[PDB]
Point group: C3
């Protein structure tokens, strides 16, 4: 329900996902679609990476994405398309296992690649578009 | 379950998110779909130069893989009810930036006179050893 | 405010062609509008006024990229304040801090969703490329 003179773009700010400090928001909702920033494997509780391994960072990324999606009114089952960026193509298999477990039976469209490097030395970054 | 001849086929045959599954494009075996349709738009996965008929790459060269990528995109789009002419935006990823020129020629030939918005870059490496990967959004 | 100008003047897809941003001389358009959303190509730091990069540095190219994006968006009928999501690509991750200062300056108080990474390389040896989706 409306709370006085709702806008075309809505900022999503989950207190469970890493804080968007800086020139970006965790996600923006526009015309019923949720446009999510590329999450990295930071744990909001410590402000640091969940660990130094692709396994630990990948699990934290997928958890962070869930937090943002649920905050927006969306969910993992409503994700339309993801893009999955790795610091090292050799880590793609371990990533894929964790990604598949996080989505269960739901299978978004996807594009993946190894970047030359990611912000903050992250080993993995995942962004997505979802629906309400 | 799915629609046939652009008509519903029972509760379950139509839903907010529709999985696109062309038997002509590489099979999506793992945790992704070739494309997802949502609110009249088709969100396509990054195609790589695999030939569904063999389960393997169309060839070892940038020319053969780029042609296969474009053809695969066409199969997925047309399966969804879209087409190359309805592509809105692509992202073109290369394993070697020096391949930009040859890739561009094949990409342009596939789109004819249609000109999607585009972003291009060379990745450090692509899934499955691909030389080229192209994803896109299109409209129905 | 805008009105149709005869059958064929308006279509499902609209090409955005700002004369102030670098001309799209290849098989692409600066942006495409579809169903009230504007899908912008990756801008690199070319200056329309010269036809060359604004400068050799990350500072000059980042400022020019943000300006180019603003020109495409305003041509389309959108604006920096209506940007929903950007993807920011760098030739070198060490340039992230300088790029980010210029990006934040350009957006002011508006905070789109964002993904960033360094590529192995960008077209024409560009140091920075930024694409986006925005609403009308």
């Amino acid at each position: 329900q409306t709370q006085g003179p709702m806008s075309k773009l809505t900022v999503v700010a989950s207190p469970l996902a890493p804080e968007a400090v800086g020139a970006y928001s965790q996600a923006i909702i526009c015309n019923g679609m949720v446009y999510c920033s590329g999450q990295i494997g930071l744990d909001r509780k410590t402000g640091d990476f969940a660990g130094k391994t692709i396994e630990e960072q990948s699990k934290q990324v997928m958890t962070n994405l869930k937090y943002v999606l649920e905050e927006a009114g969306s969910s993992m089952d409503k994700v339309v398309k993801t893009t999955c960026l790795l610091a090292d193509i050799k880590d793609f298999g371990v990533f894929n296992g964790i990604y598949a477990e996080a989505f269960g039976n739901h299978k978004p469209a996807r594009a993946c690649f190894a970047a030359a490097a990611l912000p903050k030395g992250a080993l993995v970054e995942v962004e997505c578009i979802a629906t309400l």
